[PDB]
Amino acid sequence: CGSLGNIHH
Amino acid sequence: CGSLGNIHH
Amino acid sequence: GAMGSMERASLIQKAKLAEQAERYEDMAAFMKGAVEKGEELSNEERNLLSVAYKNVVGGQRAAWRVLSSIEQKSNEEGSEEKGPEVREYREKVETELQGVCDTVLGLLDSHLIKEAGDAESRVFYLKMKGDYYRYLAEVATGDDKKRIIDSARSAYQEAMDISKKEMPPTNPIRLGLALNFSVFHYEIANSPEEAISLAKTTFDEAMADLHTLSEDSYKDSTLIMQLLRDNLTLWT
Amino acid sequence: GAMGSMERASLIQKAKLAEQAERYEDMAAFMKGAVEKGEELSNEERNLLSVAYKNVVGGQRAAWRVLSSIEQKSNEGSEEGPEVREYREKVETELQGVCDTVLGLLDSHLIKEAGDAESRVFYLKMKGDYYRYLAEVATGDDKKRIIDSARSAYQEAMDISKKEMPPTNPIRLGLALNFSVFHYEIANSPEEAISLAKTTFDEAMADLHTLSEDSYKDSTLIMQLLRDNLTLWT
């Protein structure tokens, strides 16, 4: 799973 | 241009 | 601190240059200096602080996970005794990670949170407090480990309570908070069903409010929604 | 130094761990500590040293180029303070310090103790490379001397490599590659760059038949970069 910081931009 | 270091292993 | 002689504006300028140069340690040191000027941070400045430390701690967590895995493997059955070096090195990286987390939590406690009255700023800072206690929890194993977990949960919960009262369901900070709190539930708190429920309710309530948004707001909200969805896909 | 109390073998072990964790600053500090134990380095250990410092200085050079480009743009209808220059200088100074550190290791005492061609050429190539990185950011009274320092180190390496190593030896090939880049990018000698790359490629091609499959893979990998540079340069 991803957290917010992983999203690009 | 690339130098040696640029080559992957 | 080392940044005490530099102008606030110059520290912000240099934080943006450091970002461009992918010099995130420098970026974080500049933003720490800027916080320590004692003034509240603008929206854009809060984002610079968050990006700087996310990158620094992100490299440390990535390293810690590599080292932890090697350490676990070395403690298997049939594994050759390699001495203390893997544990020592994992400990070194762990301690450095904990120090960065403690630094960010200290900026939040002295005095960013207390001066943050608008919902946008207060929620942002409490989300950050939850996140950096979560990073502490990822490597915790001691007498205090339950308290570290509870500290992340309390900060996230306070942020959640404000965000639901004061922000629309599509607000990107509200969305990213809910995303991160769902990751806390899945990865830290051993609460996969709470994680799944939270991500689903967040996604659905955001979907129903997209109609209110401009094209540019829509793009940001849907980007975070996509990560909620992708986590849900993985978790179910 | 901070690594004085750690065993040599533990420093090498932790360098390898640092590499796996992509902690190259740590990797370099461990390898510096190992060098400072005073013993000669093995092939594998020389490669760890080079990989560590390449990654550290490579991040700095990439940062420096970003900042220099912004600085160049500022100085031209451009709106005016000192921050960009100050920050580029900060990164430059750090870069110079890492290069000075590597050169110091080479001079105290890696080169002097290196008698085999493989080790001596490896370290003279490194010396060329770190003077080349100094040259990339140099603009003072000593800039020509920095350039000549890189040229002299590379030339000594070239002279040993031609006498003692086959034309496919990867260190010999990497050297020639890097000296060609020196000629093109630093010494304002594109024709020397092109000639060196071409001759190196052709002499290597003619020696491939002598190699095992594994050696052939390493040699052709470097030859491919010589060719790609030539394609760009012509």
Ligand SMILES: *Cc1ccc(S(=O)(=O)N2CCNc3ccccc32)cc1
């Ligand atoms: C925690 C958090 C959530 C949103 C934001 S943002 O400023 O809206 N923003 C920049 C950081 N990442 C991001 C991804 C998707 C959509 C917007 C953003 C900041 C911090």
Ligand SMILES: *Cc1ccc(S(=O)(=O)N2CCNc3ccccc32)cc1
């Ligand atoms: C300068 C130099 C040239 C070759 C080598 S190596 O150890 O032969 N090797 C193989 C090909 N490319 C490469 C890239 C990075 C590191 C090592 C190698 C070492 C040093």
